[PDB]
Structure 1
Amino acid sequence: VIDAFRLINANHEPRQTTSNLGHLNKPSIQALIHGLNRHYYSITINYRKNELEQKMLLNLHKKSWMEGLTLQDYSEHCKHNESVVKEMLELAKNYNKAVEEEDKMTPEQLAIKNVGKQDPKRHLEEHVDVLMTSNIVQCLAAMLDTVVFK
């Protein structure tokens, strides 16, 4: 949240118009209340950047290369998998207990069925995505290493 200003004198229109470049921002209610376009006027802000700035701003979030080919402590892998599956067991039970409804529930009542109560479907979707991504990545790393280093 940022903006650039300048002062309007006591003279009419403060500035002249030869494009739509001024009128693209829809000034906020608070700024108007506190004096915008009455005592001061805004100016468009441009964040233009050169080539080397662009190249380093892209290079901040980049980890070392070794991190790419590091496996996980396999024991921790298995513990994580068994924990999530032991959660999916109960989530599947609740999914069953919840699909049986949705017929004996008013079309409006459903929109409130899920407020303060776990929903099995969404959690199952999240856990399935997590499990499947993690396992695929670990497997691929293991195979890729198995080949690269002798």
Structure 2
Amino acid sequence: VIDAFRLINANMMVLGHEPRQTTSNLGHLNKPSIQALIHGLNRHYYSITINYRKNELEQKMLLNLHKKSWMEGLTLQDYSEHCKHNESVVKEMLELAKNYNKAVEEEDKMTPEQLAIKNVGKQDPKRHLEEHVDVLMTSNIVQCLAAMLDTVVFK
């Protein structure tokens, strides 16, 4: 949140403060707020529109401050922790699917408009399954792909 203000003359209200020869600083591109309209806003001063100018020297510098070098890209984590992590996720997925069975097979005939009102408690199947699908697949295929890259790049 940022704002820039320019003081206007409080002696001249009958005339126009800015003629607005175009539609740049207006309801265009921004709207005046409510709390600014209480303590002042278009009274005693006004607001101006901010844009950010970015030079190429800093433009091609700002977009690259998150990456790492090549040791991060080609690194298998460990296989013992990976096996234990997959074991833990499959182990909780067992009980989660066991709950999912009862959740599907109950499905009390009364329109979700209230089945979303008895879901607002602690109930959780059908929603944690696909998250576990994502964290299993996107952590297994990446590790297998990196294992292949490591085993045939170096030789």
Query: Given the two structures, how large is their TM-score scaled by the length of structure 2?
Result: 0.87
Contact 2:3/2:47 (8 A) holds in 1? yes
Shift of the alpha carbon at 1:21? Answer: 6.0
Question: Unpaired segments of 5 or more residues in structure 2?
Answer: 12-16
The aligned residue for residue 122 of structure 1 is 127
Q: Structure 1 CA distance, aligned partners of 2:136 and 2:24?
A: 53
The aligned residue for residue 137 of structure 1 is 142
What SS class does the counterpart of residue 113 from structure 1 fall into?
coil
Contact 1:69/1:141 (8 A) holds in 2? yes
Shift of the alpha carbon at 1:104? Answer: 2.9
Q: For the structure 1 residues 59 and 19, does the alpha-carbon distance in structure 2 shift closer, same or farther, using more than 3 Å as the test?
A: closer
What SS class does the counterpart of residue 112 from structure 1 fall into?
coil
Shift of the alpha carbon at 1:14? Answer: 7.3
Q: For the structure 1 residues 139 and 18, does the alpha-carbon distance in structure 2 shift closer, same or farther, using more than 3 Å as the test?
A: closer
Q: Which moved more, 1:75-84 or 1:52-61?
A: 52-61
Shift of the alpha carbon at 1:13? Answer: 5.5
Higher helix share: 1
Q: Cα deviation per residue 1:43-78 (whole Å; 9 max; x = unaligned)?
A: 110111011111111111111221000001110000
Shift of the alpha carbon at 1:7? Answer: 0.6
Shift of the alpha carbon at 1:100? Answer: 1.4
Q: For the structure 1 residues 17 and 7, does the alpha-carbon distance in structure 2 shift closer, same or farther, using more than 3 Å as the test?
A: farther
What is the RMSD computed on CA atoms of the aligned residues? 2.0
Q: Structure 1 CA distance, aligned partners of 2:123 and 2:75?
A: 36
Aligned length: 150
Shift of the alpha carbon at 1:17? Answer: 4.5
Q: For the structure 1 residues 19 and 86, does the alpha-carbon distance in structure 2 shift closer, same or farther, using more than 3 Å as the test?
A: closer
Contact 1:8/1:41 (8 A) holds in 2? yes
Q: For the structure 1 residues 19 and 138, does the alpha-carbon distance in structure 2 shift closer, same or farther, using more than 3 Å as the test?
A: closer
Q: For the structure 1 residues 93 and 105, does the alpha-carbon distance in structure 2 shift closer, same or farther, using more than 3 Å as the test?
A: farther
Q: Cα deviation per residue 1:11-54 (whole Å; 9 max; x = unaligned)?
A: 46576556566633111111111100111111110111011111
Q: Which moved more, 1:2-11 or 1:89-98?
A: 2-11
Q: Structure 2 CA distance, aligned partners of 1:39 and 1:14?
A: 17
Q: Structure 2 CA distance, aligned partners of 1:77 and 1:3?
A: 49
Q: For the structure 1 residues 37 and 20, does the alpha-carbon distance in structure 2 shift closer, same or farther, using more than 3 Å as the test?
A: closer
Shift of the alpha carbon at 1:122? Answer: 1.4
Q: Structure 2 CA distance, aligned partners of 1:132 and 1:96?
A: 23
What SS class does the counterpart of residue 46 from structure 2 fall into?
strand
Q: For the structure 1 residues 24 and 34, does the alpha-carbon distance in structure 2 shift closer, same or farther, using more than 3 Å as the test?
A: same
The aligned residue for residue 8 of structure 1 is 8
